[PDB]
Motif scaffolding. Structure first.
Motif, PDB file in Angstrom:
ATOM      1  N   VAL A 188       0.975  -0.940  -0.048  1.00 58.58           N
ATOM      2  CA  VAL A 188       0.189   0.364  -0.312  1.00 58.58           C
ATOM      3  C   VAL A 188       0.569   0.917  -0.096  1.00 58.58           C
ATOM      4  CG1 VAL A 188      -2.674  -1.139   1.316  1.00 58.58           C
ATOM      5  CG2 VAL A 188      -0.218  -0.402   2.426  1.00 58.58           C
ATOM      6  N   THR A 238      -1.063  -4.664   2.610  1.00 60.20           N
ATOM      7  CA  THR A 238      -0.206  -5.006   3.468  1.00 60.20           C
ATOM      8  C   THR A 238       2.086  -6.099   3.525  1.00 60.20           C
ATOM      9  OG1 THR A 238      -1.073  -5.806   5.566  1.00 60.20           O
ATOM     10  CG2 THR A 238      -1.103  -3.606   4.649  1.00 60.20           C
ATOM     11  N   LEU A 239       2.424  -5.283   4.002  1.00 61.19           N
ATOM     12  CA  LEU A 239       3.599  -6.607   5.104  1.00 61.19           C
ATOM     13  C   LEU A 239       2.767  -7.925   5.580  1.00 61.19           C
ATOM     14  CD1 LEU A 239       6.500  -7.756   5.513  1.00 61.19           C
ATOM     15  CD2 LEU A 239       6.302  -6.285   7.522  1.00 61.19           C
ATOM     16  N   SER A 240       1.941  -7.862   6.137  1.00 61.22           N
ATOM     17  CA  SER A 240       1.169  -8.615   7.096  1.00 61.22           C
ATOM     18  C   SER A 240       0.421  -9.916   5.851  1.00 61.22           C
ATOM     19  CB  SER A 240       0.421  -8.468   8.593  1.00 61.22           C
ATOM     20  OG  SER A 240      -0.401  -7.583   8.139  1.00 61.22           O
ATOM     21  N   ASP A 241      -0.255  -8.754   5.335  1.00 62.62           N
ATOM     22  CA  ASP A 241      -0.742 -10.064   4.234  1.00 62.62           C
ATOM     23  C   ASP A 241      -0.053 -10.945   3.700  1.00 62.62           C
ATOM     24  OD1 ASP A 241      -3.495  -8.395   4.653  1.00 62.62           O
ATOM     25  OD2 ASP A 241      -3.006  -7.058   3.633  1.00 62.62           O
ATOM     26  N   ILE A 285       2.359 -12.511   4.126  1.00 59.44           N
ATOM     27  CA  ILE A 285       3.268 -12.933   5.390  1.00 59.44           C
ATOM     28  C   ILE A 285       2.090 -14.289   5.269  1.00 59.44           C
ATOM     29  CG2 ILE A 285       4.153 -13.891   8.111  1.00 59.44           C
ATOM     30  CD1 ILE A 285       5.296 -10.490   7.565  1.00 59.44           C
ATOM     31  N   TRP A 327      12.489  -4.092  10.181  1.00 57.71           N
ATOM     32  CA  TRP A 327      11.659  -4.995  10.102  1.00 57.71           C
ATOM     33  C   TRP A 327      12.107  -6.934  10.709  1.00 57.71           C
ATOM     34  CZ3 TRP A 327       9.696  -5.673   3.790  1.00 57.71           C
ATOM     35  CH2 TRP A 327       9.063  -4.934   3.449  1.00 57.71           C
ATOM     36  N   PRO A 328      11.790  -7.984  10.814  1.00 54.03           N
ATOM     37  CA  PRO A 328      11.507  -9.141  11.158  1.00 54.03           C
ATOM     38  C   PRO A 328      12.162  -9.508  10.061  1.00 54.03           C
ATOM     39  CG  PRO A 328       9.673  -8.847  11.408  1.00 54.03           C
ATOM     40  CD  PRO A 328       9.408  -7.373  10.848  1.00 54.03           C
ATOM     41  N   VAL A 330       8.593 -14.754   9.926  1.00 58.36           N
ATOM     42  CA  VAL A 330       7.588 -14.579  11.257  1.00 58.36           C
ATOM     43  C   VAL A 330       7.148 -16.183  10.357  1.00 58.36           C
ATOM     44  CG1 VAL A 330       5.613 -13.177  11.085  1.00 58.36           C
ATOM     45  CG2 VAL A 330       7.618 -12.592  10.791  1.00 58.36           C
ATOM     46  N   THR A 350      -1.718  -7.023  -5.249  1.00 59.47           N
ATOM     47  CA  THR A 350      -2.375  -7.849  -4.094  1.00 59.47           C
ATOM     48  C   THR A 350      -1.520  -8.483  -3.660  1.00 59.47           C
ATOM     49  OG1 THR A 350      -4.201  -9.021  -4.694  1.00 59.47           O
ATOM     50  CG2 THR A 350      -4.825  -7.147  -4.154  1.00 59.47           C
TER      51      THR A 350
END
Ligand SMILES: [Zn+2]
Ligand SMILES: [Zn+2]
Ligand SMILES: [Zn+2]
Ligand SMILES: [Zn+2]
Ligand SMILES: [Zn+2]
Ligand SMILES: [Zn+2]
Ligand SMILES: [Zn+2]
Ligand SMILES: [Zn+2]
Ligand SMILES: [Zn+2]
Lengths: 234, 234, 234
Positions: A10, A18-21, A23, A58-59, A62, A184
């Motif tokens: 985004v 996002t990064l979490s999506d 992962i 950033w980690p 994950v 996406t």
């Protein structure tokens, strides 16, 4: 192929995950290693340069998935310069570069060619994204050859002259990298079409970076990247 | 400590998590109360002021976690003014303020000091973020004293002169607030390093805001915040 | 009502949820079909126009939930023009339009009225959002009538003269659309207040678009949308 090297968040409004999506999708689709490569700052609808500098936080890992910090830089001129600063370089692991209109408008073939080759020869880049883009006509063999000599991979891009590129890289002896160029997380790791292009030319599996995390990370170490300990088990 | 008071979302491109990422991480790490404090609008790579005004729509509680609406405002000048409007103030619960280059460039010690003290004395702020930042030299004791008198907490910042700050707040009698200054949700609530600084000075646990939600919310009520009913059980 | 037609993502900093948050909330709240309608590009704190053009990449269905690509366009002038380009139109399924200050400042009643009617008559719009907004005085009956004639729905907006609008649409014979105008996914599908307005006027359930996915999608097909195969089972 459990590695995808080219995707967007985004940080551009023309992307939506996002990064979490990413992962979460990787976990669901069995991807063990990926890179976020947002468009470089000179592009329109691209993030602030700080977006790349602050990726150092950033980690690494994950839910078992390794995460590479990258950029899809914009080639700016015939000198092979890109919109990536020294401070930006220090935070990043993967440098992809390619031609995008608002930064570099398609010119004569010879211009596109010299600008791409100079970018390749600069030593500052690991991968040229979608070099098969018809909008930017180039001397394919000359590019592939330069890429083989400078150890830069040419992208075969799913989001997407790709058969020509692939056979060219086959004969020149270089690396091919696979990238979904996802905007996406739903298309993450999706290479079906890339795969067909490669089969149609009988490309050697030994030269596809994405075969395994270790092969991709070995390549980055060959280009000068200090090893990433958190990635040993991938 | 089950409260974290300082973190950032994608509203800045140099951060990478959303409101939903922070809620999910809090649940996973046993955090019962947190605040989103995006950079103030005068800063570069910060959101539109409407971003703060429209936080009035946020739910109070999700999956048992309470959510505070905040801002990390930028100190603008020696008069202690910040980039937070009256309309913005009305939507917010937690006001943090601090020095950030693009808005306020480090000046002489005396300038930084007067600007910080004026911000503290203004009555418009609950917490000064990372006052221990070497880039902005200040008279620590004078700041701590002002903070104790005006009932403003000085941040001990994990993302991050912090021992000096902590011993100073210890003797002046003020509050310390702990903040991860997370730019992803992965470091939410992560205070290990802060904790060491505090131990090294034998800081009184009684003066750490983050010990419990109720202690933090009591402090905001002491500063003039109408009580938040949805938070009673925290 | 298992359809919600009006919501916003982080593409505006005054919203706080992503595409993935909305999918997850819909699943939790039994919503089978929704539309993301970000503010149009001429508005302040709105995304780049590419944000709308690149929605063509979105998956149609995730976890059983269908996803419509939309825009909340801004009415620009008395000619009924909106900030939606031809290229943008080609990527989108749902076109909502309405009055927003920074683009169109409230003028005399007659101006607002002619601009709304022209937008309705243009043929380029499916829904007028929050026409009941007191800030923009209009001749309600004239608008409803125009809406009935041009087969445009008038929104009854939850986030939010709505009783007047509803009785007007009742008598003129047009469609009403329900929209949460969510700026987080937490209020998705939340129409309690809308519902009261409609009950107070005894609105016919037969003219509420949101009753079912099929009814909403039939309406879009009546307006000229090629059928969406992935939606058959909704
Ligand atoms: Zn892109
Ligand atoms: Zn590209
Ligand atoms: Zn790309
Ligand atoms: Zn920051
Ligand atoms: Zn700060
Ligand atoms: Zn901060
Ligand atoms: Zn809005
Ligand atoms: Zn609106
Ligand atoms: Zn809206």
């Amino acid at each position: 192929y459990p590695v995808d090297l080219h995707m967007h968040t985004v940080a551009s409004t023309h992307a939506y995950s996002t990064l979490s999506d990413y992962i979460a999708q990787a976990k669901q689709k069995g991807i063990k290693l990926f890179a976020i490569t947002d468009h470089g700052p000179d592009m329109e609808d691209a993030p602030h340069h700080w977006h790349f500098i602050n990726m150092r936080i950033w980690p690494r890992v994950v839910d078992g998935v390794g995460i590479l910090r990258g950029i899809e830089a914009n080639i700016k001129n015939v000198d092979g310069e890109i919109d990536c600063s020294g401070k930006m370089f220090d935070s990043l692991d993967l440098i992809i570069a390619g031609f995008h209109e608002p930064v570099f408008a398609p010119h004569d073939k010879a211009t596109n060619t010299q600008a791409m080759i100079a970018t390749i020869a600069s030593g500052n880049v690991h991968i040229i994204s979608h070099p098969g883009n018809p909008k930017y006509e180039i001397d394919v063999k000359a590019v592939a050859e330069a890429a083989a000599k400078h150890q830069v991979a040419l992208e075969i891009n799913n989001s997407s002259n790709c058969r020509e590129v692939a056979a060219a890289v086959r004969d020149a002896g270089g690396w091919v990298a696979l990238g979904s160029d996802s905007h996406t997380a739903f298309t993450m790791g999706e290479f079906e079409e890339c795969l067909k292009i490669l089969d149609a030319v009988d490309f050697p599996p030994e030269r596809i970076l994405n075969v395994s995390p270790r092969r991709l990370l070995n390549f980055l170490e060959s280009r000068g990247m200090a090893p990433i300990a958190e990635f040993a088990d991938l």
